[PDB]
Amino acid sequence: KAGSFGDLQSRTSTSNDLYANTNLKLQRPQAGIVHTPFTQVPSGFERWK
């Protein structure tokens, strides 16, 4: 649910597969500078702790 407990689930500790929804969304760079700004909900594992 992107913010609760399972926003990053990996089948083992070194799996190449990785399921992760985090509500990532890209925003427009502004006023003539080069950067990539994004927006996502904070960590669900951190919120669980």
Next chain:
Amino acid sequence: PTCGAHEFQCSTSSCIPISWVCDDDADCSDQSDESLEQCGR
């Protein structure tokens, strides 16, 4: 005993990797790695 081929034993069965010798860090308890003989400084 002795440690593996990728580990350098300092003393008292405590070994460090090969790149971890003479690297300005006394990682070992006996500090045998930076001794004037192994390091020469």
Next chain:
Amino acid sequence: DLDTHFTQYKLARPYIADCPNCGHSRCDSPIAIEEVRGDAHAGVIRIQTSAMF
């Protein structure tokens, strides 16, 4: 050896990238704070910049 930790770092260089609030008006600076990491247990953090130390 101390040289073993710098074999792949001799091939890299510093760079100038933008960062907000040098002084007042969002400079382009040799120091550019990217990816501050603060998940330790005594307030010790690791800061990645653009300069080479």
